Amino acid sequence: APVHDPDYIGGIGKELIVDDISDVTSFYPSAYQEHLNFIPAPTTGSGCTRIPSFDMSTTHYCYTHNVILSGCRDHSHSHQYLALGVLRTSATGRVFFSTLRSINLDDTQNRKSCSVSATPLGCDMLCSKVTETEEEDYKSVAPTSMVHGRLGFDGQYHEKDLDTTVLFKDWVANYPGVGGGSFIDDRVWFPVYGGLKPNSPSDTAQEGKYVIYKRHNNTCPDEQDYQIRMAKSSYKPGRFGGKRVQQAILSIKVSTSLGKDPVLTIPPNTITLMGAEGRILTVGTSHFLYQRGSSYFSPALLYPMTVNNKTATLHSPYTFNAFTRPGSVPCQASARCPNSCITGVYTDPYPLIFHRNHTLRGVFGTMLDDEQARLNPVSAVFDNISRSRVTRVSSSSTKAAYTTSTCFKVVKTNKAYCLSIAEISNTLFGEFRIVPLLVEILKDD
Amino acid sequence: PVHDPDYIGGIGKELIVDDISDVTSFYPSAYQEHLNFIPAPTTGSGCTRIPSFDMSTTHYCYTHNVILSGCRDHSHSHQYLALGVLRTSATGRVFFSTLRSINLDDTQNRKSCSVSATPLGCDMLCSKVTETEEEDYKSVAPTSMVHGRLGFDGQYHEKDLDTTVLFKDWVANYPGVGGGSFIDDRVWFPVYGGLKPNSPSDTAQEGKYVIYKRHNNTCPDEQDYQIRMAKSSYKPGRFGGKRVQQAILSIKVSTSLGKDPVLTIPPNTITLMGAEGRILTVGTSHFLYQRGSSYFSPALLYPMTVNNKTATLHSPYTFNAFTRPGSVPCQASARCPNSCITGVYTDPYPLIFHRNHTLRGVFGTMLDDEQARLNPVSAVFDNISRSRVTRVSSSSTKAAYTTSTCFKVVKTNKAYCLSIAEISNTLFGEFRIVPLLVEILKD
Amino acid sequence: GCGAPVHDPDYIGGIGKELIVDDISDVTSFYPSAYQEHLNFIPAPTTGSGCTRIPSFDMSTTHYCYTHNVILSGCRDHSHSHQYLALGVLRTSATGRVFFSTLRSINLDDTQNRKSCSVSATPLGCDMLCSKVTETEEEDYKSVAPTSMVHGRLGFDGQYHEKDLDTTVLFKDWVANYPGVGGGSFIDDRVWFPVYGGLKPNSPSDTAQEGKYVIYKRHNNTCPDEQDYQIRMAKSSYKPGRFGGKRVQQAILSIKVSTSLGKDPVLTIPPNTITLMGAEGRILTVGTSHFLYQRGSSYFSPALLYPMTVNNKTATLHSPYTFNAFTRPGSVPCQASARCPNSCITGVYTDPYPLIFHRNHTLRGVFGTMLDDEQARLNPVSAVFDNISRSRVTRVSSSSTKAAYTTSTCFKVVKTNKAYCLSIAEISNTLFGEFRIVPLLVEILKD
Amino acid sequence: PVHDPDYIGGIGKELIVDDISDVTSFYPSAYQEHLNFIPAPTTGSGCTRIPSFDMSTTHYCYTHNVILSGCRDHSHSHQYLALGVLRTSATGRVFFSTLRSINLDDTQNRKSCSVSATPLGCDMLCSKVTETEEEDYKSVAPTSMVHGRLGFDGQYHEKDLDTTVLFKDWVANYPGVGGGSFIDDRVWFPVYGGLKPNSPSDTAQEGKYVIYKRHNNTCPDEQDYQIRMAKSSYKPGRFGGKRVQQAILSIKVSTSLGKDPVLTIPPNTITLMGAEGRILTVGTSHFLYQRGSSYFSPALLYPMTVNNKTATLHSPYTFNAFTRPGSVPCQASARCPNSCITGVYTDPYPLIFHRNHTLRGVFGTMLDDEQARLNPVSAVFDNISRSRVTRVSSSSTKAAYTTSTCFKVVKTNKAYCLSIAEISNTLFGEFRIVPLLVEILKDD
Numbered sequence A: 001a002p003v004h005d006p007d008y009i010g011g012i013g014k015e016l017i018v019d020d021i022s023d024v025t026s027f028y029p030s031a032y033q034e035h036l037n038f039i040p041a042p043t044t045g046s047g048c049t050r051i052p053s054f055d056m057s058t059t060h061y062c063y064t065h066n067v068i069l070s071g072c073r074d075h076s077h078s079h080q081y082l083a084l085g086v087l088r089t090s091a092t093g094r095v096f097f098s099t100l101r102s103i104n105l106d107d108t109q110n111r112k113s114c115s116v117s118a119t120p121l122g123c124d125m126l127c128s129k130v131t132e133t134e135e136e137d138y139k140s141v142a143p144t145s146m147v148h149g150r151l152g153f154d155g156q157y158h159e160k161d162l163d164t165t166v167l168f169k170d171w172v173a174n175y176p177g178v179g180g181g182s183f184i185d186d187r188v189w190f191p192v193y194g195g196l197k198p199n200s201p202s203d204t205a206q207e208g209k210y211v212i213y214k215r216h217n218n219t220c221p222d223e224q225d226y227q228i229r230m231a232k233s234s235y236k237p238g239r240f241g242g243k244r245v246q247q248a249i250l251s252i253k254v255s256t257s258l259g260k261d262p263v264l265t266i267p268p269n270t271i272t273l274m275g276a277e278g279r280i281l282t283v284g285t286s287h288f289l290y291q292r293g294s295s296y297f298s299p300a301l302l303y304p305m306t307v308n309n310k311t312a313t314l315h316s317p318y319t320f321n322a323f324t325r326p327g328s329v330p331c332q333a334s335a336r337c338p339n340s341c342i343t344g345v346y347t348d349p350y351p352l353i354f355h356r357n358h359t360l361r362g363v364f365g366t367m368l369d370d371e372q373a374r375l376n377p378v379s380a381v382f383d384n385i386s387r388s389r390v391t392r393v394s395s396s397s398t399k400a401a402y403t404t405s406t407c408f409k410v411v412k413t414n415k416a417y418c419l420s421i422a423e424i425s426n427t428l429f430g431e432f433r434i435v436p437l438l439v440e441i442l443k444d445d
Numbered sequence B: 001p002v003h004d005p006d007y008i009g010g011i012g013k014e015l016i017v018d019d020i021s022d023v024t025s026f027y028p029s030a031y032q033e034h035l036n037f038i039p040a041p042t043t044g045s046g047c048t049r050i051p052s053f054d055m056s057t058t059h060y061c062y063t064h065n066v067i068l069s070g071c072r073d074h075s076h077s078h079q080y081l082a083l084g085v086l087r088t089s090a091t092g093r094v095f096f097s098t099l100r101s102i103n104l105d106d107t108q109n110r111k112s113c114s115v116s117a118t119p120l121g122c123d124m125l126c127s128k129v130t131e132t133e134e135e136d137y138k139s140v141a142p143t144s145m146v147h148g149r150l151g152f153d154g155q156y157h158e159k160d161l162d163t164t165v166l167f168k169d170w171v172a173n174y175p176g177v178g179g180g181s182f183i184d185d186r187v188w189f190p191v192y193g194g195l196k197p198n199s200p201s202d203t204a205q206e207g208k209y210v211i212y213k214r215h216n217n218t219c220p221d222e223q224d225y226q227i228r229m230a231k232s233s234y235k236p237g238r239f240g241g242k243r244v245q246q247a248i249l250s251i252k253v254s255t256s257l258g259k260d261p262v263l264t265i266p267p268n269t270i271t272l273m274g275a276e277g278r279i280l281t282v283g284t285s286h287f288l289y290q291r292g293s294s295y296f297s298p299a300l301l302y303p304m305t306v307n308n309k310t311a312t313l314h315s316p317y318t319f320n321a322f323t324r325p326g327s328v329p330c331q332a333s334a335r336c337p338n339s340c341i342t343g344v345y346t347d348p349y350p351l352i353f354h355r356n357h358t359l360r361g362v363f364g365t366m367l368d369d370e371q372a373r374l375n376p377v378s379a380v381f382d383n384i385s386r387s388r389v390t391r392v393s394s395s396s397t398k399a400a401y402t403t404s405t406c407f408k409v410v411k412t413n414k415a416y417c418l419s420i421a422e423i424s425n426t427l428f429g430e431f432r433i434v435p436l437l438v439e440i441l442k443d
Numbered sequence C: 001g002c003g004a005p006v007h008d009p010d011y012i013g014g015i016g017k018e019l020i021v022d023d024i025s026d027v028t029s030f031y032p033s034a035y036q037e038h039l040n041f042i043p044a045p046t047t048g049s050g051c052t053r054i055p056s057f058d059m060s061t062t063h064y065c066y067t068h069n070v071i072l073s074g075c076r077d078h079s080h081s082h083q084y085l086a087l088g089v090l091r092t093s094a095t096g097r098v099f100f101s102t103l104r105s106i107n108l109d110d111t112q113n114r115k116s117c118s119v120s121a122t123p124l125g126c127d128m129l130c131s132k133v134t135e136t137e138e139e140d141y142k143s144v145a146p147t148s149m150v151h152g153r154l155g156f157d158g159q160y161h162e163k164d165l166d167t168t169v170l171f172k173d174w175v176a177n178y179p180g181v182g183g184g185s186f187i188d189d190r191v192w193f194p195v196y197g198g199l200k201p202n203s204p205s206d207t208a209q210e211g212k213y214v215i216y217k218r219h220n221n222t223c224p225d226e227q228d229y230q231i232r233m234a235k236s237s238y239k240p241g242r243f244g245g246k247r248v249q250q251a252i253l254s255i256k257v258s259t260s261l262g263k264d265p266v267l268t269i270p271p272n273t274i275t276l277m278g279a280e281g282r283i284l285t286v287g288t289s290h291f292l293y294q295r296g297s298s299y300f301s302p303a304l305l306y307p308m309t310v311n312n313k314t315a316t317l318h319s320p321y322t323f324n325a326f327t328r329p330g331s332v333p334c335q336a337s338a339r340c341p342n343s344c345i346t347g348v349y350t351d352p353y354p355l356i357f358h359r360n361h362t363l364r365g366v367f368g369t370m371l372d373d374e375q376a377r378l379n380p381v382s383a384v385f386d387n388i389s390r391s392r393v394t395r396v397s398s399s400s401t402k403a404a405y406t407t408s409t410c411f412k413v414v415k416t417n418k419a420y421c422l423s424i425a426e427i428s429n430t431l432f433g434e435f436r437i438v439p440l441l442v443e444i445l446k447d
Numbered sequence D: 001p002v003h004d005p006d007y008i009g010g011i012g013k014e015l016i017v018d019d020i021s022d023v024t025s026f027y028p029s030a031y032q033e034h035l036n037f038i039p040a041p042t043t044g045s046g047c048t049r050i051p052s053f054d055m056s057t058t059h060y061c062y063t064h065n066v067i068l069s070g071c072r073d074h075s076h077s078h079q080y081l082a083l084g085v086l087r088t089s090a091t092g093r094v095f096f097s098t099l100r101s102i103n104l105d106d107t108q109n110r111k112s113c114s115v116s117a118t119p120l121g122c123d124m125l126c127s128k129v130t131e132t133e134e135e136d137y138k139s140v141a142p143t144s145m146v147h148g149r150l151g152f153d154g155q156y157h158e159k160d161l162d163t164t165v166l167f168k169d170w171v172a173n174y175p176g177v178g179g180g181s182f183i184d185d186r187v188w189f190p191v192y193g194g195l196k197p198n199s200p201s202d203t204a205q206e207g208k209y210v211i212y213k214r215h216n217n218t219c220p221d222e223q224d225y226q227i228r229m230a231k232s233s234y235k236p237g238r239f240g241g242k243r244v245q246q247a248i249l250s251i252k253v254s255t256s257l258g259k260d261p262v263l264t265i266p267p268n269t270i271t272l273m274g275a276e277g278r279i280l281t282v283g284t285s286h287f288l289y290q291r292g293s294s295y296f297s298p299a300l301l302y303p304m305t306v307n308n309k310t311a312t313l314h315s316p317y318t319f320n321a322f323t324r325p326g327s328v329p330c331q332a333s334a335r336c337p338n339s340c341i342t343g344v345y346t347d348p349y350p351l352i353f354h355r356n357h358t359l360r361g362v363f364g365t366m367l368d369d370e371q372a373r374l375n376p377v378s379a380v381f382d383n384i385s386r387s388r389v390t391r392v393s394s395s396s397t398k399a400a401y402t403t404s405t406c407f408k409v410v411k412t413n414k415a416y417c418l419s420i421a422e423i424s425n426t427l428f429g430e431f432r433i434v435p436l437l438v439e440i441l442k443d444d
């Protein structure tokens, strides 16, 4: 029923800047712009608001984040904030995000790692229902419970538990990838990751599969079969005792029946690195999988994704060598060799500048500009090697964490905007505030 | 659009009726997480200030002023406006669920806006300013004013009031920031401003004054001197000796905005110097909160009686420990009449009543400092005392306006007080406006 | 100004897309409004005998392209001719009313006789594929050389440049060959054009078709002739008597779009187990789907859309969508209500624009202007069609009226969320020549 | 944005300078195909009417009015506006190439618009009407008027004139429909309307009249009767006896629209009753064409001299065979003064000149009927005669306004006359506006 102001409709989910000639990094973000903050901040000293997910279709946006009363990471009950809204314009021509349905989902169930997607029926959610820590989940035999929910245009929420005993038979743990999903054709597509049980069909299918991705102009000096050894062990990090940590994609038919006809796609690990959080993006006619750099590879990754009815295929990724993320040694931001780790942080890149033949040239995102610590969020435009002039939250050292970015255009002014939702350090009210930062994309001629 | 039925009977009523208990045996819990319905700034210089809030038995209304470049820029601003309903999650936790969330931003500069929840939506009274307050007090024409409404459909409409007639005796005039109230088919707003010297309204107040006193803390000045100082408190030096006057504006609620407005000016034998304020309705009682911008520090609630289109004020309730910071000689501990414009908006919400409806106790968030806007502290107050408190921080913390509203989740038998407070911010602007929530407990 | 223009902002997001995505509604509950006034961007004749005919139209997300052929002395005069060319953008007035705003408007009139021209909107302007004709079609099928062809382009600066194709090589296996009149389409760095003509008997291309045929059938109306007879007839339908039994063949030509015209041309010939006898046609791109429209010049009357997939420089066609009430007039035994395979060259160009889709992108309904007559080119009526039925109609006239070719393209004004269909129709004229080419406009309604 | 160099020296000049030849030995060719730059209607009731055309040595301007529901409807309308340049194809065939093609359609009802090609683009003068002509003659305020411009960038800007001051003495006032002309840093538009009875402008025409006569066809009425009829002709009965008056408006051409407008009201000892018209510039001569809305049938061209911001008119050239249909007693063959509002806009383009610049011949498309708007016929005319003609049809055919402009393709040594004509349509509304093109030939 509700729809964005027509100022935005033709500029959402599109290839924003089509340019074959200009240097990608001649495009750069403006100063942050003041607009209607649609993301609730904590109201107590210990309250934890973390794990944002965001998706926007040409009719509405969907947003969610997790809330824990007593502090973050606490093994405790949690609830989700959920919002459904539309873009509007003031009389002065300034965009604002206008939320229509704004609820807390807080009941007997502990929904974690939730991803959201804007579908024709409202805001679809994929969550894990957890009663164990991740550490414990990798040791129990049963897969993790998972639920497909929807906040409807009427503001009501309904959900259906998936049959994970069947759907995730070959897994010991499984979680949505936190980043948004995408509605494609008649289905909703969500990133998933978790652990495979040893010697299952899915595990055997990945036996001996690996890929080594390299830094630009910065060769790993290690011997080659040593690199191969380390790349293989990177799929089985020591934190969970040698279980293969696997990337997947889950598609669900969009219908008034939730959980209808789900299909799991597991790409070969000759393409994907160790399973991690991620996001399914649709820009123009192209789809991508973002995968968080939780393993040894630091440059931001976008795997081209093509849809084959109910399944997907991924292709060799775009990489953005200056769009690093912090991580612990030996997988810090400047890392160049394969190795085994679980680290990094979710900071996704939004496809922004394209050739006319639709090859991606440049992305926008907010990176944490530090070698090892989650510090100094910086918004910028990135090509395969370089980074534009940047916009920073603070000229002082500042703690931050996850960021997820989405860009859209106002075609009547030909202005490109980028929204960057970032977990930022807070004072007085909890560890984090989740801030929707807004920039305009400018050009330095 | 209506509140969840868990709230039926829990909104705008006398929450605690108790003749026997000590008032300060009631006290606020620690702050509670709920759904923060108030947008925080998103840039380093963004200014969100001046909150207004009112809630009827069907919906709530909220607004605050936004300036892009910092809080003392006079050139342009916009208002954030929200219309919403109270909800409960499945576990019984409160959340404020906004339904209509808009920025009102055009070429007009709407300032000092008050909102009120009426049967047609969220009514707003704003001044449309073209010059500073200081300049307004020096120009002969009254300040322009507008009656707006955000409807349940999310559309905003407004009508300019005929201030040339309605405020002909005034040089400057503003809504009182605090919420208004819908009573007997009219919406009622606090107003304040300056009167034209020797206008009929100014002449009607000549010689009028009132001295309100601190509990068990006598002014040592002699009575004659106190009277001179109380008279001069209505004509502070900042605006060159014009009388600064309290008033109340009522408007017929109708699809026609601005219908039949009527200005009531109480005698200054009851009211102190005009200031920001709020019209409250709790049960069948109404009150005018008046900010303590003059010499009197304790929080003030004037009982208000509605007689069709006008109202009568009565001698106020005072809450001696509910002080506010101010400049010398009108600091929080001041006890003598004097002339000043200082203080801060921190309103008290009527909470504990006698069975005969006499008010005993209030909830609010005070700034617990003598002179500086520091240290917001939530508590229950009677005429003399303060309960055990809840604080945003144990460290010294800048803050400003607070406005409080209490309600009951009847379903869970839990009484709550919302305290919307301007709190110092880091990284993103001068202030963040935070809706603090406490449960009222009993010791 | 050599840089590219763009439609008004009201249209961005509403050009070349799936206009109505609806799984549940009856297709024919959508219907056209009355015709709407807008800016007629198509020149009418200015003399008693002037012939304006053979419209071609294609519109990209940045601009539209339009052309038609002009003959001074009458329409079938096998003589010199010229082309009107227009490059423009869609606009809205202050009231929101649609208008087509032409930016480059030229007559291309020189020593060359360009015929049967198709146009396509590419990132460099308006690409044109024409035959350069020095013999009638009847003479052409009798001479061994293929027809000359040219790839031209009107640029955004208003200049026209062109390159003759190497038809002696490119069309080595052909005796005659023409573009399909209907618009081409820009897909994956190349421009794609419909083509048709005659094959050299026993040439490699001709032997690759030997024995190939397909019988397409009417809805709920069975042909009574014996099966072996139907097959004999279907086979002979590829070799009409008009050109002495040479095979008349459908094809698709793709050209790399570059400042170098005529670059890297590649011819695709689909198997005649899929296509009927070659005819005029159009390459359509709607959303992510491509289609070849094929004029019903043979025995099959319902409008045809063959799904088209692009591989690299070649195309693959699939079994067609058919719209049983979107018929066209033809001479007996291939009239509008024909149901049996037979051999004939008749019909008329009236294309269908894909309009209503399933969520999974299966096509449900089209818009077009048919000629509503069994045998004569009469009575144009605009309608929405599904596989069986026709919506409520809009008519140019309640009296009997001569018309000919129609080509339709639909678009949405995103600002108002209204869908429109343009129908460019050759309509009988009085005083000024045989035809006026009229851009009809309707809004698509739902009752 | 300029015409092809094949036209240099062929635009806006005296096309045929000849003292010797019979004017009517020049004659138009058959109509020729070129590029029809004028949109036709696309619906059954669509009304396209009231063309205006002007061409400078760099570009041409064109406009016409559009009503959705029929030609008499009065509620709302829009204008089609075109800025273009003359081109030649490789074979030398003329084509009019429009560069900017827009519909101007908003809440405002612009009527009776005239255009003129200025160095800044296509200037337009329109009335912004809120009541019918009948009702405007009865209201005290003058008609609102706007000066707009379609620029070379395709953007349109406009500014309302201060008509309460500029047209203080008028009850109604409209541009003359025919094109205006750029002369000496100002654009010049024909205007007509009604004067406030007893205003200074009205009293300044009191007792003023002029009687123009047919060639070799004297009015038999007695002289005092003719004088009374001639005076009455300026106050026709349709609008209750108000004086209907000719004028000329000049505006300074500037990035500021509506700059320094000045109105000229010529004396009615020269002009007949106010009517539609056109300001023409050909060589160094300027002329005011005035439609024959009153008793006088032959086509009229008043020589016009520009002083500074005002104009002076002189006794007109008349072309006795270039008649127009009208209702009795002001029909095509009328010869006596009378009072009427009738006729039709069909202008004559100055074509053939003596070496001393005195005009000898014009081209135009006349409606060749006594009383009805029928039978458009293109021809060359002198003061008394008509050349061999070219016809749209040998059958009786309804038509209305025509406006003609001639030019030379210097490269091919061919002179052409464009004749934009409202012609009866079938299927698509009442009229199609057709740009007819002829080559000027010589018998010899």
Ligand SMILES: *[C@@H]1O[C@H](CO)[C@@H](O)[C@H](O)[C@H]1NC(C)=O
Pocket (backbone or CB within 6 Å): A020, A355, A356, A357, A358, A359
């Ligand atoms: C796309 O186009 C650009 C420039 O036109 C070229 O550099 C790039 O290699 C192309 N890639 C593909 C896959 O077409």
Ligand SMILES: *[C@@H]1O[C@H](CO)[C@@H](O)[C@H](O)[C@H]1NC(C)=O
Pocket (backbone or CB within 6 Å): B019, B354, B356, B357, B358
């Ligand atoms: C109400 O009752 C209290 C004590 O019960 C008394 O002190 C007070 O004066 C009473 N007031 C009224 C108005 O009844």
Ligand SMILES: *[C@@H]1O[C@H](CO)[C@@H](O)[C@H](O)[C@H]1NC(C)=O
Pocket (backbone or CB within 6 Å): C023, C358, C359, C360, C361, C362
């Ligand atoms: C698309 O969906 C419709 C409706 O369920 C169905 O009839 C049709 O066959 C589907 N097409 C494909 C290719 O699955």
Ligand SMILES: *[C@@H]1O[C@H](CO)[C@@H](O)[C@H](O)[C@H]1NC(C)=O
Pocket (backbone or CB within 6 Å): D354, D356, D357, D358
């Ligand atoms: C120009 O020459 C002709 C030739 O007789 C003459 O009639 C006309 O009066 C001349 N023009 C002027 C202005 O004398």
Ligand SMILES: [Ca+2]
Pocket (backbone or CB within 6 Å): A136, A137, A138, A139, A140, A141, A142, A143, A144, A172, A173
């Ligand atoms: Ca497990």
Ligand SMILES: [Ca+2]
Pocket (backbone or CB within 6 Å): B135, B136, B137, B138, B139, B140, B141, B142, B143, B171, B172
């Ligand atoms: Ca003032």
Ligand SMILES: [Ca+2]
Pocket (backbone or CB within 6 Å): C139, C140, C141, C142, C143, C144, C145, C146, C147, C174, C175, C176
């Ligand atoms: Ca041949």
Ligand SMILES: [Ca+2]
Pocket (backbone or CB within 6 Å): D135, D136, D137, D138, D139, D140, D141, D142, D143, D170, D171, D172
């Ligand atoms: Ca008037």
